[PDB]
Design a protein around this motif. Structure first.
Motif, short mmCIF file in Angstrom:
data_model
loop_
_atom_site.label_atom_id
_atom_site.label_comp_id
_atom_site.label_asym_id
_atom_site.label_seq_id
_atom_site.Cartn_x
_atom_site.Cartn_y
_atom_site.Cartn_z
N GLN A 1 0.71 -1.32 0.18
CA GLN A 1 -0.05 0.03 0.07
C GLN A 1 0.84 1.12 -0.07
O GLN A 1 1.87 1.46 0.91
N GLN A 2 0.71 2.24 -0.81
CA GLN A 2 1.37 3.41 -0.93
C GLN A 2 1.44 4.39 0.41
O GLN A 2 0.40 4.25 1.05
N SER A 3 2.53 4.87 0.63
CA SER A 3 2.80 5.76 1.96
C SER A 3 2.72 7.26 1.66
O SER A 3 2.49 7.67 0.22
N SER B 1 5.41 8.02 -1.18
CA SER B 1 5.44 7.62 -2.36
C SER B 1 3.91 8.56 -3.14
O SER B 1 4.07 8.88 -4.26
N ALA B 2 3.03 8.79 -2.09
CA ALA B 2 1.68 9.67 -2.73
C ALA B 2 2.32 11.00 -3.00
O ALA B 2 1.79 11.31 -4.36
#
Ligand SMILES: O=C(O)Cc1c[nH]c2ccccc12
Ligand SMILES: O=C(O)Cc1c[nH]c2ccccc12
Lengths: 104, 106
Positions: free
Chosen positions: A1-3, A6-7
């Motif tokens: 799941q993106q952090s 990363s977002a």
């Protein structure tokens, strides 16, 4: 799941893409698109774009065989598969317009 | 002729194909279909490269970012900076000046 890291980076890349798209939009409105595209794209990248239009056209037309796509457009089976998937995933307004303009 | 017939014939076919793309995208912009068209025609990494190349061009024209920052922020090493600078030098001055107005507007 993106952090959050990363977002944040993905949103920054998205904004950079939209800035290119807008720059080119304006270039077309000032008849500077041809030199802009020569600056921003390498020759082989421009060639790829021209060929990909043909591939899309011929996939939509449905007349050329796989062997003809390979010999005439250089598009092997995996490239045809990918391109077909891009078409399937495109929004309906784009597919309808491409059929109108490429097959007219 | 500048090229032999084999090379000339292939170059003219590529030129026609390029102009077809240019016209297709021109009209896509008018119809608000440019985003999906570009998603179809360009891979994600190719779209990212174009976004980054705009920033490189901007920062080369602005003159403030250092060589180390160009590499660490924009992935542009010495050879890439040299190539990009050469593309800017080769471009028509009209394009360069327009880029300065648009990209450095602030
Ligand atoms: O030279 C390259 O690697 C690709 C490229 C095409 N247009 C450019 C503009 C600025 C920086 C790099 C590029
Ligand atoms: O899949 C690829 O290798 C590149 C590509 C991007 N858009 C395309 C449209 C049609 C055919 C190939 C491509």
């Amino acid at each position: 799941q993106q952090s959050p890291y990363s977002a944040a980076m993905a949103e920054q890349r998205h904004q950079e893409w939209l800035r290119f798209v807008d720059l080119l939009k304006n270039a077309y409105q000032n008849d500077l698109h041809l030199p802009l595209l020569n600056l921003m794209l390498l020759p082989d990248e421009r060639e790829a774009l021209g060929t990909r239009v043909r591939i899309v056209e011929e996939l939509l037309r449905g007349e050329m065989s796989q062997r003809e796509l390979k010999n005439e457009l250089g598009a092997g089976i995996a490239m045809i598969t990918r391109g077909s998937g891009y078409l399937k995933a495109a929004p309906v307004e784009l597919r309808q317009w491409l059929e109108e303009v490429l097959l007219k």
